[PDB]
Amino acid sequence: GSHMSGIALSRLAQERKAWRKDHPFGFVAVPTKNPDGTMNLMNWECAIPGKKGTPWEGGLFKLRMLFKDDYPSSPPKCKFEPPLFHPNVYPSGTVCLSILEEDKDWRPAITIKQILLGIQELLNEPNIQDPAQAEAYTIYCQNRVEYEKRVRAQAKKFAPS
Amino acid sequence: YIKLKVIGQDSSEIHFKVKMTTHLKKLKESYCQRQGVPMNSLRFLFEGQRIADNHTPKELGMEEEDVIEVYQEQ
C-alpha cells in the first residue's frame, strides 16, 4: 500500500461519494479493482458521452483517469482508450487541456465532474491554436466536411452496444 | 430498503425504494408501468453496465440516493 497516498485517497473517496449521488447524464466514472477485488481509487475508467446536436452525438467515449500521490495538488492524467481522433488528443490518447495542467488552469478544488465536463466540451470545440495530433488538426483545418465524416464515423463506431 | 433515483434524457426525476436484496427485475417492470410504455421499450443502466432482471442491489453494491439512468430500448 502506498503510505504516500493518504491525502489523495481521502480526497478520492469523497470524490467518488459525491459522483454517485449526483453526476451528468450519460457519463461514467468508476474506480478500477485491484488484482484481487480491492477498490483502486488511483485508477478510474470513465466514459464521456458525445454532446447532442453535434457530430459526436450518440458516441460513448472511454478514457482512463490516473491520479498521482500528490493529487489533488497535481491534476490527474487523462488518456482516451483507445486513442481518439481529435486535434487536442495525442496519438497516445493523452488529452490536452488547460485545467489538467499544474503550471496553468488546474486548481486542487476542481472535481472529476468538472474535468469530465471539460473534456466533453473540448470534443466539439477543439483548440486549433494548440494541436496535439497532426492528422486531426490538418483535416480540421483543410477539409472540415471530411473532418465531420471522420468524427461521425468515430461516434458511430463507439455508440453504446 | 434503499433509495434509488431513476432519471433520463428528459431529466424526468422519479425516486423509488426497494430492499437491498429484492429482485431488481421488479423495479425494471415497475418503471415501465409507472411511466406508460412497453416493457422492452426501455433500457436501464448503472455505473455504465446494463441492469439485468436477476440482479441484486447487494450485488451491484448500490447505496442510498444512488442513480439509475434509463434509455429508450433500441
Curated annotation (Swiss-Prot), chain A:
There is a cross-link at K21 (Glycyl lysine isopeptide (Lys-Gly) (interchain with G-Cter in ubiquitin)). SMART domains: UBCc. The active site is at C96 (glycyl thioester intermediate). There is a cross-link at K21, K51, K52, K104 (Glycyl lysine isopeptide (Lys-Gly) (interchain with G-Cter in SUMO2)). Keywords: Acetylation, ATP-binding, Cell cycle, Cell division, Chromosome partition, Cytoplasm, Host-virus interaction, Isopeptide bond, Mitosis, Nucleotide-binding, Nucleus, Phosphoprotein, Transferase, Ubl conjugation, Ubl conjugation pathway. Phosphorylation at Ser-74 significantly enhances SUMOylation activity. Residues 7-160 form the UBC core domain. Changing K62A: Impairs binding to RANBP2. One of its GO terms (cellular component) is nucleoplasm. The record marks D103, K104 as: Substrate binding. It is found in: Nucleus; Cytoplasm; Cytoplasm, Perinuclear region. The modification N-acetylserine is found at S5. Belongs to the ubiquitin-conjugating enzyme family. This is SUMO-conjugating enzyme UBC9. It comes from Homo sapiens (Human). The lineage of its organism: Eukaryota, Metazoa, Chordata, Craniata, Vertebrata.
Swiss-Prot record, chain B:
The chain holds residues 21 to 94 of 101 of the full protein. The keyword Isomerase does not apply. The record marks F16 as: Interaction with PIAS2. It comes from the Eukaryota. Ubiquitin-like protein that can be covalently attached to proteins as a monomer or a lysine-linked polymer. Covalent attachment via an isopeptide bond to its substrates requires prior activation by the E1 complex SAE1-SAE2 and linkage to the E2 enzyme UBE2I, and can be promoted by E3 ligases such as PIAS1-4, RANBP2 or CBX4. This post-translational modification on lysine residues of proteins plays a crucial role in a number of cellular processes such as nuclear transport, DNA replication and repair, mitosis and signal transduction. Keywords: Acetylation, Cell membrane, Chromosomal rearrangement, Cytoplasm, Host-virus interaction, Isopeptide bond, Membrane, Nucleus, Phosphoprotein, Ubl conjugation, Ubl conjugation pathway. It comes from Homo sapiens. There is a cross-link at K3, K17, K19, K25, K26 (Glycyl lysine isopeptide (Lys-Gly) (interchain with G-Cter in SUMO2)). The keyword Ion transport does not apply. Covalently attached to KCNB1; UBE2I increases cross-linking with KCNB1 and PIAS1 decreases cross-links with KCNB1. Interacts with SAE2, RANBP2, PIAS1 and PIAS2. Interacts with PRKN. Covalently attached to a number of proteins such as IKFZ1, PML, RANGAP1, HIPK2, SP100, p53, p73-alpha, MDM2, JUN, DNMT3B and TDG. Also interacts with HIF1A, HIPK2, HIPK3, CHD3, EXOSC9, RAD51 and RAD52. Interacts with USP25 (via ts SIM domain); the interaction weakly sumoylates USP25. Interacts with SIMC1, CASP8AP2, RNF111 and SOBP (via SIM domains). Interacts with BHLHE40/DEC1. Interacts with RWDD3. (Microbial infection) Interacts with Epstein-barr virus BGLF4. The modification Phosphoserine is found at S12. GO terms for cellular component: cytosol; glutamatergic synapse; nuclear body; nuclear membrane; nuclear pore; nuclear speck; nuclear stress granule; nucleolus. It is linked to Non-syndromic orofacial cleft 10: A birth defect consisting of cleft lips with or without cleft palate. Cleft lips are associated with cleft palate in two-third of cases. A cleft lip can occur on one or both sides and range in severity from a simple notch in the upper lip to a complete opening in the lip extending into the floor of the nostril and involving the upper gum. There is a cross-link at K5 (Glycyl lysine isopeptide (Lys-Gly) (interchain with G-Cter in SUMO1)). Its main location: nucleus. Cleavage of precursor form by SENP1 or SENP2 is necessary for function. One of its GO terms (biological process) is negative regulation of delayed rectifier potassium channel activity. Residues 17-20 are annotated as: (Microbial infection) Interaction with Tula hantavirus. Belongs to the ubiquitin family. SUMO subfamily. This is Small ubiquitin-related modifier 1. GO terms for molecular function: enzyme binding; potassium channel regulator activity; protein tag activity; RNA binding; small protein activating enzyme binding; transcription factor binding; transporter activator activity; ubiquitin protein ligase binding. Signal peptide: none annotated. Disulfide bonds: none annotated. Residues 1-74 form the Ubiquitin-like domain.
